[PDB]
Structure formats: structure tokens, C-alpha cells
Design an enzyme around this catalytic site. Structure first.
Site: not given
Ligand SMILES: [Cl-]
Ligand SMILES: [Cl-]
Ligand code: NA
Length: 129
Positions: A35, A46, A48, A50, A52, A59
Site C-alpha cells: 500500500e 482516488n 472520486d 478522495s 488515501d 481512505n
């Protein structure tokens, strides 16, 4: 902070992640590797809108507030910047809530695709715990 593999394993163990919800330590180290590459400062945006955050790429859509994900929630009740600290406590405490929400570690895409069903014990071999 970029953790060493055994360094991170020891810190996760101290914070109660070993066998938490039945996930051995190797699972958590494997997930952190793919990750974030063990980097607490990793961020990724991301599609959308958002983002991380941190060593477990938590998230902002659901788990933390960064002030820039409209309509999102903050179920870990923390600013997302707290997930980037060299102190991994905030990330661990939030990940504990995520893995307990019914879907286990499948919430982490890299764990599902790169750690699940592998010999995750290899990620803690040789480390003093
Ligand atoms: Cl393990
Ligand atoms: Cl993946
Ligand atoms: Na949020």
C-alpha cells in the site's frame, strides 16, 4: 518515516495487530508494503476525489477528514494528516476499526491482490519480536 520491515513488524505487534481479528502479523506487514512501501507519508488521490493516507492508505471517503472530500465521513474521528505521522498509533487504531467492519482486510485492495492466499509469514521471518 520509511520503516524497515522488521521495524514495522515490531511496532505493529506492540500496538495489538498480531492476530487482530484473526489476521497474523505477516498480513499487516504485507499490506503496508504494497500500500505504501512502508512510508508513513504516502498519499494517493482516488478517482472520486478522495485521498488515501499513510502507511495503510486509509481512505478519506469514510475514515478521516481532510476537508476536501465532500459528503465523506470521518468514522475514525481523526484528521487525515494524523495518519502521516512517524507514530503509527493513529493508523493502527483506525485500521482496527476498518478490519472490524465486516469485510476484514479485503478493504485493502493491495492485500486482496498481493497478500491474500500467500505465505504472509515470510514478511516477518528473521525479525526479533
Ligand atoms: Cl504471519
Ligand atoms: Cl492491487
Ligand atoms: Na472524510
Amino acid at each position: 518515516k520509511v520503516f524497515g520491515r522488521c521495524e514495522l513488524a515490531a511496532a505493529m505487534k506492540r500496538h495489538g495487530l498480531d492476530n487482530y481479528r484473526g489476521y497474523s502479523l505477516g498480513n499487516w506487514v504485507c499490506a503496508a508494503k504494497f500500500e505504501s512501501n512502508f512510508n508513513t507519508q504516502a498519499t494517493n488521490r482516488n478517482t472520486d476525489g478522495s485521498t488515501d493516507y499513510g502507511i495503510l492508505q486509509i481512505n478519506s471517503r469514510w475514515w478521516c477528514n481532510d476537508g476536501r472530500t465532500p459528503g465523506s465521513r470521518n468514522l475514525c474521528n481523526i484528521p487525515c494528516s494524523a495518519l502521516l505521522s512517524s507514530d503509527i498509533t493513529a493508523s493502527v487504531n483506525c485500521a482496527k476499526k476498518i478490519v472490524s467492519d465486516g469485510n476484514g482486510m479485503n478493504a485493502w485492495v493491495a492485500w486482496r491482490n498481493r497478500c491474500k492466499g500467500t505465505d504472509v509469514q515470510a514478511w516477518i521471518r528473521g525479525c526479533r519480536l
